[PDB]
Symmetry: D2
Subunit: 338 residues, 4 copies
């Protein structure tokens, strides 16, 4: 029978890792979750009991050398992405990596070289908004010329207040954590790069974040290479739920993706007025996008086609995020290319 | 100087009467509130102090015979409308009357005759939705042919729950009280008459209304002369505010007027979700429409033009409402013309 | 390994049949599409090529007697449902049947008996709205007591105008075709039965439907056993897309499910105003619900649990729809139990 | 009789001047439009014919010295505001002035001194958003503590594309023209001043604006004195109508004023999807606010109360706008106080 089953090994079984693992094991066509790596025991036992994973490992290199797998999903903390990407490729495995690709520009370029030396292997970064139905619908309108050339993009990513308490005592920075997907969306929609940025921020609700070098809310203005404008807001304290919204203003029109984060098709009317319930967290909002990107990765290997999300999209995402962080600490305009 | 000041006398200084009186005295161009009639003393003192009305009367005929007025606003209880309309016309005064025109078909036809014998005097019924900006905008689309021929109209009029307690111990019927404006809207938009109706109702939240021969919620289905369909819902127990909504389905499109009763342009987002505050009562929702119909009445006299709301619109409104009430009591289909 | 793979045979490979078949073959866990029955050759070849179905049949009884299947999906025209349900159960197969269960009350009761004689086999009717995320969310609010007791339900099912031309030359009636899901929704939310109904209708846009004994738009008012009110509208000519909307008015609140049929989270702003794109047809709107009901059927067999959609829900749906049709032809109130 | 009629003279009978003049003459209580000044003949003839203005003048000082007026409305081009304000106050007239107060900081401080020397005369600047029902409703929520302390304000003012052609051949700058009301809104809601700003802009749709030192779209990021953040967008090319929107993010919630610029309560559904018509221009959107601010000015004189909009609100508005313009030309962060 034609085009068989891709056996996948996963590393990282935190919240996001468990989503990918569960999806691969139960919902994704032509895929099997064969192996898992974690150095937390309870996580490996979860993988065996809940998902019936056959091979467990305490060490990533041990998994890639010995497990019966064709591909890996890297969902470890960001500091490990580059070394795990390189090892997997060197052992002849296809690679899906969560964002960001890495944290250090020099180290990222070393990985770009390794990736280029394995052109026969698929490499995909987890920019899942590119697979979200609403984002894709908007991209289609833009590609068809329906709003003309893009003059301004505004994107907000604000985590729910429900997670603030855990964060306070729980980073890498606000823009690195929260805005990388927004940076990618800007590049994806425009085809252009970010030139210079200024970013400001505030810890009003939780001033303890000041001493921790963290931010609860930040905003940025960005000028792109052709003088295109972009506005970012990132935050960790949205009272109404998970607020991810992207606005595109063009010469012929305007559109918004999730102007408000509608949960479903239910409207409630009571003494409080007219109420639309909201989506509450990222797994709820982006459930479909996660499944679609996972399936796209599996199909890319089976059909030997490139998905079009490159190490370069990863590098630029990290670079712009670093530039935003630097602009915030200096409180001055920073050029991204520097 | 050209086209002077219309002096107006008012009878009825309940909630609605006070709105008209205040508007005429302070906001309406080319009008003066000259006289007021009421047999509640406190009301006449209010009219003198608050509005500086010059002539007060305890008797309507006394006012129309002796006051220095050109026109009257009849805002008395519905049982008095016909006799006050006739008296005012016989004394040579222009007449604005609140709905309904009257309660008894035979008595209404007697008044139609009196009105016909005074063709040089203006007569206007208070169907204020015809002057509401949103209703007028929809009428314009319909007249321009933008939704084609009308196949179905659904109209809801539901008073806020906040008034239920006072109503319980406080009628004429639900459809007479609440649906007359909806009946007029149906006739206004279509140009057609209502043929047969069935109406049902329920006193779920306040079953004490059963013994009082009143209804807290009722619904009706109506077939118009050309087989056009209409649906009515009337109620006294809306939790979210004052719900007045009209939906028109046509062969080429559909529109809704106040799908939800938005208060203003403010959206609130908090832990409850996305909230739109609502309008709470009729004076808030129809403030503009009241002012516009009052000004139209005054201008109709000054410019000697007919506004186009006739005693016949009044008769048919009362007739259809009676038919709905009869259908409800019999629990059977009733033909309106009978 | 525990709880294996349910092999399914399908009959009916029209539009809806192909959706179920594709889903079962590619997306549903623990299921295999093993066999297909059709007497259109092209359909069987589609099933073999596209879905790799192993066993094809020209005759339903041949499939149920000889194919290697544990369960059947009946997606044939409604006139065949009862005889295929009985045959499948008699051959020891679990049964999913699309709506309606059947068309003749007497014949339906015969099938109810056969079903009762096979209590160890699962039987499920395709009322997919019970599995839709938005309907389930509303049901949850209702069950939690959040809108109090239900006083009125309004449900609209209107097919897109895009299908009118094919329908004209293409029935069973409007209420049978379009309103069965609405009838089920009413029963599901309330727990109550429908007592008496009146239905009217019109063929304004396409009067050729008059001679065919069909309806393009119809409306109905229904009184339930406890004097609960329900309003239905069914149609085949919605200009804006596929309009399926359910409104529930309670003593403490109100909710609407898909007040407007939003396609996604994209809002467009151009010279036409503010635009929300709409879902266009049933497969788009109810994609999730179809997958969920299919998975629920498969899991019900594996876990030996009843889903709770019975032959009785089927009987009552057909009965009320027949009553609506009779009320329309007589233009009079009809009691459902008669 | 108590508290008489305020006689008003107006200068400036362009689009905005005609709105104020018409309102004062026909709608405003206790006011009379007595005199008009213009050096365009047709404008004075309009004032006499259309509004029955008694005294016309070609020279502003001639009007203030000789006309029978108690107060003046200054609706001349911005370059004349300061000299006309001073002259009116010196001749003992109450003053309403449109924004901006003036263009030159030094000249503005000279006028502040003149204003201080006439403390017995009312002075009011035309920041009409402070009188808009939706803005006032939001201010009320903020004052009541309902969204906590304000962390970010985003305000957009975008003129309709319908006016671009006339503008191209038709300035003072984009931020001066379009963003002064937004600056005032920020100060009004927060009580805080703007510290530093960066502004960027683009002439994508109409690059001819480059040579004219004008902007079609601009964006700005602002840091306020307590590290509060603000985002501005100003433009002249909105395809969907007049887009004025203000978003306030607080520690406990978020609100938007006119997230989309809804025209009325009508929703249209046709082949294009679900459509909300939009307001098209400033006179339509802010009709109510203009009437309210005019009435407030008249009442302030009659009741000898201060409205609370000062020359200082004017100075700071102009200062911040100049800072935004300077930041744009330098493409660098500018401190407002410098």
């Amino acid at each position: 029978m034609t085009q068989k089953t891709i056996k996948i090994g996963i590393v990282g079984l935190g919240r996001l890792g468990k989503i990918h693992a569960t999806n691969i094991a139960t919902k994704i066509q032509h895929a099997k979750l064969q192996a898992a790596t974690s150095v937390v025991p309870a996580e490996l036992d979860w993988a065996k009991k809940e998902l019936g994973v056959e091979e467990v490992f305490e060490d990533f290199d041990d998994m890639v050398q010995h497990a019966d797998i064709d591909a890996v999903f890297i969902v470890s903390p960001s500091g490990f992405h580059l070394q795990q990407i390189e090892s997997a490729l060197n052992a002849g495995k296809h690679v899906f990596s969560e964002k960001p690709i890495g944290l250090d520009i020099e180290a990222i370029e070393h990985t770009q070289q390794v990736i280029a030396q394995h052109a026969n292997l698929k490499f995909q970064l987890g920019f899942m908004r590119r697979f979200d139905d609403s984002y894709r619908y908007a991209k289609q309108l833009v590609d068809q010329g329906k709003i003309g050339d893009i003059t301004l993009i505004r994107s907000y990513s604000i985590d729910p207040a429900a997670g603030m308490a855990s964060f306070v005592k729980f980073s890498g920075g606000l823009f690195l954590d929260m805005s990388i997907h927004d940076i990618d969306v800007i590049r994806w929609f425009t085809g252009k790069e970010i030139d210079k940025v200024w970013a400001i921020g505030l810890n009003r609700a939780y001033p303890v974040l000041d001493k921790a070098g963290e931010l609860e809310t930040g905003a940025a203005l960005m000028q792109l290479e052709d003088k295109t404008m972009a506005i970012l807001v990132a935050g960790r304290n949205a009272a109404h739920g998970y607020h991810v919204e992207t606005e595109i203003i063009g010469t012929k029109g305007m559109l918004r993706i999730a102007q408000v984060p509608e949960k479903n098709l239910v409207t409630v009317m009571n003494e409080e007025g007219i109420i639309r319930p909201t989506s509450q967290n990222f797994p709820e909002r982006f459930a479909q996008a996660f499944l679609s990107e996972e399936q796209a990765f599996v199909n890319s290997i089976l059909n030997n086609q490139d998905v079009g999300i490159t190490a370069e999209d990863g590098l630029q995402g990290t670079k712009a995020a670093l530039a935003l962080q630097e602009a915030f600490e200096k409180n001055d305009i920073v050029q991204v290319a520097s």
